[PDB]
Amino acid sequence: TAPKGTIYLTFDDGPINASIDVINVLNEQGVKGTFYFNAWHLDGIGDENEDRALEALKLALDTGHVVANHSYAHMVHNCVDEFGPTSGAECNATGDHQINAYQDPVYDASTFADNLVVFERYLPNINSYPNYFGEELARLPYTNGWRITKDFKADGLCATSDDLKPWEPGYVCDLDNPSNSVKASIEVQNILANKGYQTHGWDVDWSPENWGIPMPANSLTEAEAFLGYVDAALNSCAPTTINPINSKAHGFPCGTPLHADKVVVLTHEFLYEDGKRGMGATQNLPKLAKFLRIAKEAGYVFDTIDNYTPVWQVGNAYAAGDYVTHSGTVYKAVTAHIAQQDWAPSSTSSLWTNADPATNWTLNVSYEAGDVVTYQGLRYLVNVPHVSQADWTPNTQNTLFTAL
Amino acid sequence: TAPKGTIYLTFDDGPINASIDVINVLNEQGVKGTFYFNAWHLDGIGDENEDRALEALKLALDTGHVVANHSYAHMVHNCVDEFGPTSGAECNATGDHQINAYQDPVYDASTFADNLVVFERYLPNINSYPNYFGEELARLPYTNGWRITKDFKADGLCATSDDLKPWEPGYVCDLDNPSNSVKASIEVQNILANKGYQTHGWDVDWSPENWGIPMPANSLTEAEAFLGYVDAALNSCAPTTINPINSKAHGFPCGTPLHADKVVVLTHEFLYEDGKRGMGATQNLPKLAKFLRIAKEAGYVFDTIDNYTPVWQVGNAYAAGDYVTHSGTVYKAVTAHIAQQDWAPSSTSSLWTNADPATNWTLNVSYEAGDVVTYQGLRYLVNVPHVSQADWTPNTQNTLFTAL
Numbered sequence: 001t002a003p004k005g006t007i008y009l010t011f012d013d014g015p016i017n018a019s020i021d022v023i024n025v026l027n028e029q030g031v032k033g034t035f036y037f038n039a040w041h042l043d044g045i046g047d048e049n050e051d052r053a054l055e056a057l058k059l060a061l062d063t064g065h066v067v068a069n070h071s072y073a074h075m076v077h078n079c080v081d082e083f084g085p086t087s088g089a090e091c092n093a094t095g096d097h098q099i100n101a102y103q104d105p106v107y108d109a110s111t112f113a114d115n116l117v118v119f120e121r122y123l124p125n126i127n128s129y130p131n132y133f134g135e136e137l138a139r140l141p142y143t144n145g146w147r148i149t150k151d152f153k154a155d156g157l158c159a160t161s162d163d164l165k166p167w168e169p170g171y172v173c174d175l176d177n178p179s180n181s182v183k184a185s186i187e188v189q190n191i192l193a194n195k196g197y198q199t200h201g202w203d204v205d206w207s208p209e210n211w212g213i214p215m216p217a218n219s220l221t222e223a224e225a226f227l228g229y230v231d232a233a234l235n236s237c238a239p240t241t242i243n244p245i246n247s248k249a250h251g252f253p254c255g256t257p258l259h260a261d262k263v264v265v266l267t268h269e270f271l272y273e274d275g276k277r278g279m280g281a282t283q284n285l286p287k288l289a290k291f292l293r294i295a296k297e298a299g300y301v302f303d304t305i306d307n308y309t310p311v312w313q314v315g316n317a318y319a320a321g322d323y324v325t326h327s328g329t330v331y332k333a334v335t336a337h338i339a340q341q342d343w344a345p346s347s348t349s350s351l352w353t354n355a356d357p358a359t360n361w362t363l364n365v366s367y368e369a370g371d372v373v374t375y376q377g378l379r380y381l382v383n384v385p386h387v388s389q390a391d392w393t394p395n396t397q398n399t400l401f402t403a404l
Numbered sequence: 405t406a407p408k409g410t411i412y413l414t415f416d417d418g419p420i421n422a423s424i425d426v427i428n429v430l431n432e433q434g435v436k437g438t439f440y441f442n443a444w445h446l447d448g449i450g451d452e453n454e455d456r457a458l459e460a461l462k463l464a465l466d467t468g469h470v471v472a473n474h475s476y477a478h479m480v481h482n483c484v485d486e487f488g489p490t491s492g493a494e495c496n497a498t499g500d501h502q503i504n505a506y507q508d509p510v511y512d513a514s515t516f517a518d519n520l521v522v523f524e525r526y527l528p529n530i531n532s533y534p535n536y537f538g539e540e541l542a543r544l545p546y547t548n549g550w551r552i553t554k555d556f557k558a559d560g561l562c563a564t565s566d567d568l569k570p571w572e573p574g575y576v577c578d579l580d581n582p583s584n585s586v587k588a589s590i591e592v593q594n595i596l597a598n599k600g601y602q603t604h605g606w607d608v609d610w611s612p613e614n615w616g617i618p619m620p621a622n623s624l625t626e627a628e629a630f631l632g633y634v635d636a637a638l639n640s641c642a643p644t645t646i647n648p649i650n651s652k653a654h655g656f657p658c659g660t661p662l663h664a665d666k667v668v669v670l671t672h673e674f675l676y677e678d679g680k681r682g683m684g685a686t687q688n689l690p691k692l693a694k695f696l697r698i699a700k701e702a703g704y705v706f707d708t709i710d711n712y713t714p715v716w717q718v719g720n721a722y723a724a725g726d727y728v729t730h731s732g733t734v735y736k737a738v739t740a741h742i743a744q745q746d747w748a749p750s751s752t753s754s755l756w757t758n759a760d761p762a763t764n765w766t767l768n769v770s771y772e773a774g775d776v777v778t779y780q781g782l783r784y785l786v787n788v789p790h791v792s793q794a795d796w797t798p799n800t801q802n803t804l805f806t807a808l
């Protein structure tokens with residue numbers, strides 16, 4: 001039979017000492033999580049208890065959890081005048097993380113690439129792990145932004161600010177004229193998508209109601225009530241209805257088939273530590289353990305973000321319009337069929353089209369009039385719907401494409 | 405009909421101002437070259453005439469030449485105590501480029517990843533260029549090393565040194581006990597291969613007889629005499645017989661099918677500039693232009709390294725054992741057949757096995773007894789020949805694999 005739904009438990013801002021305790025709680029019940037890591041904790045400059053950060057990274061990989069890319073230093077270089085070893089402490093003293101969080105999108109996007117270099121430096125064999133998805137799965141700091149398929153995208157238009165924090169008096173978000181930081185974050189999403197990343201936001205956040213609350217670890221919802229929030233998010237387009245306003249994923253395609261019967265849960269392992277943020281270990285590690293227990297007894301199953309878009313499999317039946325990933329690339333089924341080993345999705349497959357959320361011109365993509373592609377550094381408008389092929393390059397096809 | 409052979413003209417250490425004059429000569433005669441670029445010239449710290457480096461990079465891409473990865477700063481960080489903007493000038497003052505050229509293989513390999521970040525900084529849309537192969541084609545500084553297929557590899561065992569330069573008295577190369585710098589460069593080769601790179605060395609070097617001659621540009625071999633060198637290299641396992649000793653590709657499999665009827669030429673654009681190395685532009689640009697003409701008159705065709713391993717193409721006939729690349733991955737044909745659009749190589753194809761030069765455990769690879777794979781940070785010996793599949797991971801198949 002079918003589960004009540006699939007929960008994707010995701011943890012942000014590790015690897016830190018508290019990651020080990022969270023992972024041990026997950027391992028007690030065989031639950032796998034997705035960990036969006038910032039490698040500056042491996043360098044010891046992240047202003048957390050992080051001397052065991054490498055142990056935490058190895059533990060996550062060794063016990064089956066998925067490691068994803070959250071950028072090297074959580075955009076904290078944009079929080080200070082000059083980024084250095086004390087920048088995390090100074091941004092924590094001001095609490096200005098959300099202010100000017102994105103500035104130069106090209107440089108900001110490159111800190112996701114920097115993240116992978118540092119991962120490999122501390123763990124040279126990391127790409128021999130099948131659950132290392134640092135190059136293919138990402139999540140933008142502070143931003144409930146999504147890049148899943150060509151027709152499944154969303155952006156947090158109030159995620160970050162140019163001046164006032166979202167919990168401060170006088171804060172106003174204008175959806176028609178978003179902050180400069182939000183507009184830069186959108187460009188970061190598009191740059192990552194063009195490098196083959198998918199980015200995932202969240203439906204529910206196990207966190208303080210807002211990040212201005214003092215001692216945030218103490219105000220986490222109890223496990224039973226949180227399962228109630230998970231229930232309420234199932235098939236309800238929660239990314240658009242979530243509060244507060246800086247957590248919303250604007251433009252999220254409500255009812256899109258890939259999100260059916262799924263809830264992505266966000267939390268942070270630094271909320272599960274007894275320390276500067278409260279009694280997180282004493283209070284919240286038992287909450288996490290109880291939540292896993294009652295969710296599984298209620299009929300939920302837990303899975304990792306790498307399976308959010310199902311991996312193509314020999315012998316599976318696919319309807320027209322079904323989405324899969326094959327070798328990390330998103331494809332959509334052209335015709336209903338049963339997959340066989342020789343009919344894997346490809347750039348010349350007649351059974352699939354590439355449906356990556358990228359915008360570079362790509363082979364075997366079902367383009368629509370109004371789409372904009374980039375090719376040889378030039379942007380082109382699609383005039384006529386068609387499936388791209390090798391000889392229909394934008395620069396030679398004036399009927400299909402118009403250079404901007 | 406078939407040509408006498410295929411010449412791959414490859415240029416190292418650009419982009420510099422002289423790259424433009426070289427490209428213009430190539431374009432005048434309809435020839436495409438492969439350029440192994442170091443992006444520190446874009447940052448203006450490469451100690452060359454490079455104020456037009458970005459113009460050179462754009463010209464290479466805009467006129468159809470292939471751009472490949474030669475690392476950010478040509479391993480010059482290993483030539484000085486502290487790498488900075490003057491490091492290129494300092495290493496030029498000592499000429500110690502080959503001494504300790506490789507030290508920390510993990511960091512040295514990561515300068516190939518840094519190279520891409522810098523390329524994307526100066527040219528944010530570079531990934532929209534089909535002839536941009538920075539993420540898939542590489543060449544190690546100073547090193548005639550090859551990573552082509554699972555069964556086509558080679559290493560320059562005398563390429564770099566721990567103390568004495570290869571032309572100095574007292575220099576001894578022990579093929580059984582290579583230098584620490586050479587052993588690091590071998591690991592760099594393996595790191596790049598596990599990231600999906602191929603690395604290409606060279607058959608013949610249009611260069612001074614050895615580095616160390618004072619004016620390296622004015623003495624470049626005349627075009628007719630250099631065509632003779634190409635004639636001698638054709639099908640003669642030139643990478644193993646080439647001089648001097650630091651240019652040899654030891655372990656190069658003589659007679660390997662992918663190298664049949666091909667000659668890879670190495671040269672440097674800085675040899676084609678009127679400047680500190682002599683009158684390279686006045687004297688060597690006509691040599692290059694004449695060489696292109698007489699080589700074609702002799703029956704040679706020119707191609708780029710992205711076609712060295714032929715790209716899989718619908719309608720092409722393939723014999724069993726034929727090698728192709730498909731979406732950047734090397735495959736070997738299982739059985740003779742004509743390629744169809746729905747029958748492309750893949751990780752589950754019955755017509756092809758993966759033949760990448762990588763050593764991580766990989767799907768659809770024809771493993772032999774005695775092979776060693778890396779999986780989940782552990783190394784495994786292959787006990788029994790078999791074609792890998794998703795269900796046969798090393799940690800679950802104690803008959804097929806034995807952990808070391």
Ligand SMILES: N[C@@H]1[C@@H](O)[C@H](O[C@@H]2O[C@H](CO)[C@@H](O)[C@H](O)[C@H]2N)[C@@H](CO)O[C@H]1O
Pocket residue numbers: 012013074088092097098141142143211268
């Ligand atoms: N999802 C973010 C959340 O990460 C963030 O929490 C901060 O993260 C910083 C980086 O790890 C850390 O230095 C700081 O102490 C945390 N409070 C909050 C608040 O900025 O915003 C959420 O959107």
Ligand SMILES: N[C@@H]1[C@@H](O)[C@H](O[C@@H]2O[C@H](CO)[C@@H](O)[C@H](O)[C@H]2N)[C@@H](CO)O[C@H]1O
Pocket residue numbers: 416417450451478492496501502545546547615
């Ligand atoms: N193939 C190398 C060749 O690149 C190298 O030439 C030096 O390259 C440096 C990097 O651009 C440059 O700064 C220096 O001026 C060049 N002499 C020679 C000698 O090191 O070795 C060849 O193997």
Ligand code: NA
Pocket residue numbers: 136196197198328329330
């Ligand atoms: Na992808």
Ligand code: NA
Pocket residue numbers: 305306307308309310311324325
């Ligand atoms: Na997937």
Ligand code: NA
Pocket residue numbers: 540600601602732733734
């Ligand atoms: Na490759």
Ligand SMILES: [Zn+2]
Pocket residue numbers: 012013070074141142
């Ligand atoms: Zn975060």
Ligand SMILES: [Zn+2]
Pocket residue numbers: 416417474478545546
């Ligand atoms: Zn070089």
